[PDB]
Write an enzyme that holds these catalytic residues in place. Structure first.
Site, mmCIF file in Angstrom:
data_model
loop_
_atom_site.group_PDB
_atom_site.id
_atom_site.type_symbol
_atom_site.label_atom_id
_atom_site.label_comp_id
_atom_site.label_asym_id
_atom_site.label_seq_id
_atom_site.Cartn_x
_atom_site.Cartn_y
_atom_site.Cartn_z
ATOM 1 C CD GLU A 357 -2.776 -1.093 -0.103
ATOM 2 O OE1 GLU A 357 -3.085 -0.187 -0.852
ATOM 3 O OE2 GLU A 357 -2.954 -2.391 -0.649
ATOM 4 C CG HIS A 487 -12.348 -8.667 -11.660
ATOM 5 N ND1 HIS A 487 -12.403 -9.661 -10.469
ATOM 6 C CD2 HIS A 487 -11.566 -7.857 -11.452
ATOM 7 C CE1 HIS A 487 -11.643 -9.294 -9.865
ATOM 8 N NE2 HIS A 487 -11.065 -8.119 -10.364
HETATM 9 ZN ZN LIG Z 1 -2.765 -4.081 -4.527
#
Ligand SMILES: [Zn+2]
Ligand SMILES: *[C@@H]1O[C@H](CO)[C@@H](O)[C@H](O)[C@H]1NC(C)=O
Ligand SMILES: *[C@@H]1O[C@H](CO)[C@@H](O)[C@H](O)[C@H]1NC(C)=O
Ligand SMILES: *[C@@H]1O[C@H](CO)[C@@H](O)[C@H](O)[C@H]1NC(C)=O
Ligand SMILES: *[C@@H]1O[C@H](CO)[C@@H](O)[C@H](O)[C@H]1NC(C)=O
Ligand SMILES: *[C@@H]1O[C@H](CO)[C@@H](O)[C@H](O)[C@H]1NC(C)=O
Ligand SMILES: [Cl-]
Lengths: 597, 194
Positions: A357, A487
């Site tokens: 992150e 998805h």
């Molecule tokens: Zn990621």
């Protein structure tokens, strides 16, 4: 006077208003994900449709500037990103049919649930119930039930919705002067108007087939070894020469193979590297985890997280009173506001996700000087690859020694190296045939090379031959198994995962050679390597202001997706598998069936 | 030999908009800038032409303290010989600049939850601004030649946009109160001095 300056003035106004409207959107959605209240979801929805109505009005205003008379490809890329009107180029009757189709599909996904025929009372949502089932069950039948029942109860609802949806998506696409919706999607990888670096929307199909060609040997070897372990775990449900069943792949579809580590581990008595206890024993907290990720990034030459990141980030799960969605997430709210939302534990996994992150945050910080419309990945695959390489070079035993978190007497060896590498290959290589094959089926369906009467017939064929995975039960033409995946039913393009995997190992080998690293590519630790820092930042700083081919060349010195660095990274594991495969069949024959007896 | 109200010039309740950037004309006082320099509460203090150390006893006829609020990222545009929106269309500094730029973050005062939109910068102009000229005009900027007749629409815009100053902004997107001092030259006696 000239139309160029009309486009320039238009974008100069659009940016300065879109900035604040998106910032309001972002604060409302953040305050929601931080503190779930109905007041907050309402504030969120309000700001969201305010900004959405704004950009629809601006798309309308922008299509008043023909793309012909503009030379500045920065201005032209912004006008093209905006001018892409989307469903608003359709007749509102058809846009309404479209969006009710989309919301109906999203809710059939999210609210779907499977129920045991033994008890019409108790039954299970996908996560956590079925996801944890498929992730941890060692039982053949119960995994089969989760798989087939989730596909037969949620997919069959989405099939006709998906057919009508593909019709209206193809009409929306051919109404935008694209060839199909698949072409609309590959438009993410198109470059036009730059000599030598251009790229057409079929060049991507042939490039992906070409790189997957070279990946086929490594994947076949890993597939053969994984098949060997799985048959030493599933004695009567796998053949030595056939393909792998789909439900036995560690999760609901086989997208990643991570959960097979405990069955495929080479040195089943030599220990893994699990360093959570060293963080426990030394009073490491969430602040410590993220301070070490930040320091790991300043070691390579990238800046540290800004004070706002420390003040405004939800770094620990904040108790029982206020509720939050704990999905680890990096936030660019615009306006210099970079945050992280992550319910931090004291764990190795979270220790690494911190680096991931933070790499997302570093990519975001890199291109935030671009024009608003150009603040994104150079293409749809760059953000996550930049994030993943940091996790790689932070999980390295020499890195764990440099930070006082492992004892210098720890012995690195053949054992730990092949362990780390087979785990890595389970996660990273086992997904490439899956991602490539899914996006290939979708493209072929949008282009019309598969009539609907053969939709599923082609799906499970491209599985047997590209991914070496066979469905465990015959699937006739009423299913839409592709849409049982998130998805697909949620209208997200997929090839970002293939391109991202390949790019991450290209970047990795490039930054490791800039690190003067000697020895195998996996032991590479780009920390203290300012050279890897400059080589990564030269691409990071761009955003999508340049053809993704050019940015890729800025790091790897090649102009196009390449799979030599990946095979290089897995070379040691490659030859270990070749030694393990001396008297086993590498490769699969697509005729054997789980259900043809 | 009284003191000029430098505090309010720096401490005013809410600052002025950069397009209508406020101007104070500081005259006939004693003014030791040493405290303003070494206050160590300003995140940016750049003097162009004479360094902050000596200006304490160089003697000025009359000084102007322009003041406004901009974004942090924009402070660099307040520098002699820069380009950009704030430099071309709101506040242009001449390259023969003499006074200094004093920018300090004000994320707590000038910003507020839900955004503080009271500050406006002019986003468009049919020509660049001259040094020190102030444009308060409100006439719809005409992107093409199609007349607009005083109403917004297509290809015609309002040339005044607002900052959205929340307190969670980055340091560059944060309200920076900027006080610029430009000192004057005259053969009339130097009256701001000491
Ligand atoms: Zn990621
Ligand atoms: C949580 O939500 C309530 C109402 O939605 C709000 O009043 C409160 O300030 C929020 N908590 C924080 C820490 O902002
Ligand atoms: C394109 O536009 C940008 C900003 O509008 C400008 O800085 C750049 O020089 C332009 N490119 C060319 C080739 O003129
Ligand atoms: C990052 O390190 C530099 C090194 O001096 C420091 O000046 C800066 O303040 C650090 N970042 C933060 C957010 O403190
Ligand atoms: C990086 O350099 C610092 C400087 O002393 C050192 O302490 C640390 O062990 C090094 N780590 C790596 C992974 O090279
Ligand atoms: C603004 O007020 C503070 C508070 O007393 C003071 O220290 C400061 O000197 C004032 N500003 C100026 C320019 O004097
Ligand atoms: Cl499937």
């Amino acid at each position: 006077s000239t139309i160029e300056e009309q486009a320039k003035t238009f974008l100069d106004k659009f940016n300065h208003e879109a900035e604040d409207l998106f910032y309001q959107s972002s604060l409302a959605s953040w305050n929601y994900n931080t503190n779930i209240t109905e007041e907050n979801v309402q504030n969120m929805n309000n700001a969201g449709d305010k900004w959405s109505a704004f950009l629809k009005e601006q798309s309308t205003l922008a299509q008043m500037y023909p793309l012909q008379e503009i030379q500045n490809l920065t201005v032209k890329l912004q006008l093209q990103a905006l001018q892409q009107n989307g469903s608003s180029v359709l007749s509102e009757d058809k846009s309404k049919r479209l969006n009710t189709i989309l919301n109906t599909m999203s809710t059939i996904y999210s609210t779907g649930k499977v129920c045991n025929p033994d008890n019409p009372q108790e039954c299970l949502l996908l996560e956590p119930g079925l996801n944890e089932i498929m992730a941890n069950s060692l039982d053949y039948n119960e995994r089969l039930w989760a798989w087939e029942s989730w596909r037969s109860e949620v997919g069959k609802q989405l099939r006709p919705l998906y057919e009508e949806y593909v019709v209206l998506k193809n009409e929306m696409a051919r109404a935008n002067h694209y060839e199909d919706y698949g072409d609309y999607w590959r438009g993410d990888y198109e470059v036009n108007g730059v000599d030598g670096y251009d790229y057409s929307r079929g060049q991507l199909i042939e490039d992906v087939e070409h790189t997957f060609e070279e990946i086929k040997p490594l994947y076949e070897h890993l597939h053969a070894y994984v098949r060997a372990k799985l048959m030493n775990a599933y004695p009567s449900y796998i053949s030595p020469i056939g393909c792998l069943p789909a439900h036995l792949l560690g999760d609901m579809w086989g997208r990643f193979w991570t959960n097979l580590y405990s069955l495929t581990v080479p040195f089943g008595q030599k220990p893994n590297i699990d360093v959570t206890d060293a963080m426990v024993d030394q009073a490491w907290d969430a602040q410590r985890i993220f301070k070490e990720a930040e320091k790991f990034f300043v070691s390579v030459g990238l800046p540290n997280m800004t004070q706002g990141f420390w003040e405004n980030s939800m770094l620990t799960d904040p108790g029982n009173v206020q509720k939050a969605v704990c999905h680890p997430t990096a936030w660019d709210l615009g306006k210099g506001d970079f945050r992280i939302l992550m319910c931090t534990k004291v764990t190795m996994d979270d220790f690494l996700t911190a680096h991931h992150e933070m790499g997302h945050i570093q990519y975001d910080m890199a291109y935030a000087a671009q024009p608003f419309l150009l603040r994104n990945g150079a293409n749809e695959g760059f953000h996550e690859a930049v994030g993943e390489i940091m996790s790689l070079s932070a999980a390295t035993p020499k890195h764990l020694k440099s930070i006082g978190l492992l004892s210098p007497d720890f012995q690195e060896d053949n054992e730990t190296e092949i362990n780390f590498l087979l785990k890595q290959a389970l996660t990273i290589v086992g997904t490439l045939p899956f991602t490539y094959m899914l996006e290939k089926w979708r493209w072929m369906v949008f282009k019309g090379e598969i009539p609907k009467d053969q939709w599923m017939k082609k799906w499970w064929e491209m599985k047997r031959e590209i991914v070496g995975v066979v469905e465990p039960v015959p699937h006739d033409e009423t299913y839409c198994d592709p849409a049982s995946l998130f998805h697909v039913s949620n209208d997200y393009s997929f090839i970002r995962y293939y391109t991202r995997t390949l790019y991450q190992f290209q970047f990795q080998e490039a930054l490791c050679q800039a690190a003067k690293h000697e020895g195998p590519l996996h032991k590479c630790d780009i920390s203290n390597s300012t050279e890897a820092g400059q080589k990564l930042f030269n691409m990071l700083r761009l955003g999508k202001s340049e053809p993704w081919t050019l940015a890729l060349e800025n790091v790897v010195g090649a102009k196009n997706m390449n799979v030599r660095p990946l095979l290089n990274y897995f070379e040691p594991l490659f030859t270990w598998l070749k030694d393990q495969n001396k008297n086993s069949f590498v490769g699969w024959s697509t005729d054997w069936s789980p259900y043809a007896d | 030999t009284n003191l000029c109200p430098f505090g309010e010039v720096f401490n005013a309740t809410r600052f002025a908009s950069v397009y209508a950037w406020n101007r104070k004309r500081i005259s006939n006082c004693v003014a030791d800038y040493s405290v303003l320099y070494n206050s160590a509460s300003f995140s940016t203090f750049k003097c162009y032409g004479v360094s902050p150390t000596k200006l304490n006893d160089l003697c000025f006829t009359n000084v102007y303290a322009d003041s406004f609020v901009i974004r942090g990222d924009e402070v660099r545009q307040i520098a002699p010989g820069q380009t950009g929106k704030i430099a071309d269309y709101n506040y242009k500094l001449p390259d023969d600049f003499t006074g200094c730029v004093i920018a300090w973050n004000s994320n707590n005062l000038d910003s507020k939850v839900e955004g503080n939109y009271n500050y406006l910068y002019r986003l468009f102009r049919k020509s660049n601004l001259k040094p020190f000229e102030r444009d308060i005009s409100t006439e719809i900027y005409q992107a093409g030649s199609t007349p607009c007749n005083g109403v917004e629409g297509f290809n015609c815009y309002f040339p005044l946009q607002s900052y959205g100053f929340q307190p969670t902004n980055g340091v560059g997107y944060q309200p920076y109160r900027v006080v610029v001092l430009s000192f004057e030259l005259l053969h009339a006696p130097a009256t701001v001095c000491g």
